[PDB]
Amino acid sequence: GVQVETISPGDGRTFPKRGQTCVVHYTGMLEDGKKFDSSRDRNKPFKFMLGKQEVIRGWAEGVAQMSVGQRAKLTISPDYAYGATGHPGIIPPHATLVFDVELLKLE
Protein backbone atom coordinates (compact mmCIF):
# COMPACT_ATOMS: atom_id res chain seq x y z
CA GLY A 1 0.00 0.00 0.00
CA VAL A 2 2.98 2.24 0.67
CA GLN A 3 6.57 1.71 -0.43
CA VAL A 4 9.34 3.74 1.22
CA GLU A 5 12.61 4.60 -0.51
CA THR A 6 15.16 6.66 1.38
CA ILE A 7 16.49 9.90 -0.05
CA SER A 8 18.51 10.90 3.04
CA PRO A 9 19.02 8.70 6.10
CA GLY A 10 17.60 9.56 9.56
CA ASP A 11 19.05 8.46 12.86
CA GLY A 12 17.84 4.91 12.28
CA ARG A 13 16.71 4.76 15.88
CA THR A 14 13.88 7.23 16.70
CA PHE A 15 10.65 6.13 14.99
CA PRO A 16 7.21 7.58 15.70
CA LYS A 17 4.96 6.00 18.31
CA ARG A 18 1.24 6.01 18.00
CA GLY A 19 -0.29 9.18 19.30
CA GLN A 20 2.82 11.31 18.75
CA THR A 21 2.76 14.36 16.57
CA CYS A 22 4.87 13.96 13.43
CA VAL A 23 6.33 17.22 12.16
CA VAL A 24 7.22 16.85 8.51
CA HIS A 25 8.07 18.73 5.37
CA TYR A 26 6.45 17.15 2.28
CA THR A 27 5.58 17.47 -1.33
CA GLY A 28 2.67 15.42 -2.72
CA MET A 29 2.73 14.51 -6.40
CA LEU A 30 0.62 12.55 -8.85
CA GLU A 31 2.39 9.58 -10.42
CA ASP A 32 3.10 11.98 -13.33
CA GLY A 33 5.38 13.98 -11.06
CA LYS A 34 3.07 17.01 -10.93
CA LYS A 35 2.92 18.56 -7.44
CA PHE A 36 -0.56 19.07 -6.00
CA ASP A 37 0.36 20.09 -2.43
CA SER A 38 3.57 21.00 -0.53
CA SER A 39 4.49 22.33 2.85
CA ARG A 40 7.94 23.28 1.58
CA ASP A 41 5.84 25.77 -1.09
CA ARG A 42 4.21 27.22 2.02
CA ASN A 43 7.57 27.44 3.88
CA LYS A 44 6.01 25.91 7.02
CA PRO A 45 6.21 22.36 8.36
CA PHE A 46 3.07 20.28 8.61
CA LYS A 47 1.97 18.43 11.74
CA PHE A 48 -0.26 15.38 12.12
CA MET A 49 -0.98 12.92 14.91
CA LEU A 50 -0.04 9.32 14.11
CA GLY A 51 -3.20 7.28 14.68
CA LYS A 52 -5.72 10.10 14.28
CA GLN A 53 -6.42 9.16 10.61
CA GLU A 54 -6.26 12.88 9.60
CA VAL A 55 -3.96 12.18 6.62
CA ILE A 56 -4.24 9.48 3.92
CA ARG A 57 -3.26 6.04 5.24
CA GLY A 58 -0.15 5.58 3.12
CA TRP A 59 1.33 8.88 4.27
CA ALA A 60 0.86 8.04 7.93
CA GLU A 61 2.04 4.46 7.52
CA GLY A 62 5.06 5.55 5.51
CA VAL A 63 6.06 8.14 8.15
CA ALA A 64 5.65 5.50 10.87
CA GLN A 65 8.45 3.57 9.14
CA MET A 66 10.77 6.63 9.11
CA SER A 67 13.27 7.82 11.69
CA VAL A 68 13.80 11.38 12.78
CA GLY A 69 15.94 13.14 10.20
CA GLN A 70 15.00 10.81 7.39
CA ARG A 71 13.85 12.04 3.99
CA ALA A 72 12.09 9.50 1.79
CA LYS A 73 9.96 8.89 -1.24
CA LEU A 74 6.61 7.30 -0.34
CA THR A 75 4.91 5.61 -3.28
CA ILE A 76 1.30 5.26 -2.24
CA SER A 77 -1.30 2.98 -3.80
CA PRO A 78 -4.79 4.42 -4.40
CA ASP A 79 -5.87 1.83 -1.85
CA TYR A 80 -3.90 3.77 0.78
CA ALA A 81 -4.73 7.20 -0.68
CA TYR A 82 -8.00 8.39 -2.31
CA GLY A 83 -9.24 5.13 -3.74
CA ALA A 84 -11.63 4.70 -6.58
CA THR A 85 -13.28 8.07 -6.21
CA GLY A 86 -10.19 10.22 -5.92
CA HIS A 87 -10.74 13.90 -5.09
CA PRO A 88 -12.31 15.19 -8.32
CA GLY A 89 -10.50 18.22 -9.72
CA ILE A 90 -7.24 17.37 -7.89
CA ILE A 91 -6.71 13.60 -7.58
CA PRO A 92 -8.04 11.34 -10.31
CA PRO A 93 -9.72 7.97 -9.74
CA HIS A 94 -7.36 5.09 -8.74
CA ALA A 95 -4.37 7.41 -8.51
CA THR A 96 -0.95 6.33 -7.31
CA LEU A 97 0.66 9.25 -5.40
CA VAL A 98 4.29 9.99 -4.61
CA PHE A 99 5.14 11.97 -1.47
CA ASP A 100 8.61 13.33 -0.76
CA VAL A 101 8.59 13.51 3.05
CA GLU A 102 11.17 14.55 5.63
CA LEU A 103 10.51 13.66 9.26
CA LEU A 104 11.79 16.71 11.10
CA LYS A 105 10.84 15.97 14.69
CA LEU A 106 8.31 14.35 17.01
CA GLU A 107 6.16 16.18 19.55
For residue 48, indicate whether it is catalytic. Answer: no
- Host H or E run for residue 100: strand 97-106
**Spatial separation of the C-alpha atoms in residues 37 and 21, rounded to whole Å:** 20
Q: In this structure, which CATH number among 3.90.1150.10, 3.50.50.60, 3.30.565.10, 3.10.50.40 belongs to the domain 1-107? A: 3.10.50.40
Catalytic residue among 7, 11, 36, 90: 36
Say how many C-beta atoms besides its own lie within 10 A of residue 12's C-beta. Answer: 10
Phi, psi (deg, nearest 5) at residue 60: -60, -50
Q: What was the resolution (in A) of this experimentally determined structure?
A: 1.3
Q: Within a 13 Å sphere around the CA of 69, how many CA atoms are in the beta-carbon half? A: 6
Taking the CA atoms of residue 21, residue 24, residue 13 and residue 78 in that order, the dihedral angle to the nearest 10 degrees is 90
The single-letter code of the amino acid at 58 is: G
Domain ranges of the chain: 1-107
For residue 80, indicate whether it is catalytic. Answer: no
Cβ-based neighbours of 80, under 8 Å, separated by 6 or more = 1, 2, 56, 57, 58, 61
Structure determination technique employed:
X-ray
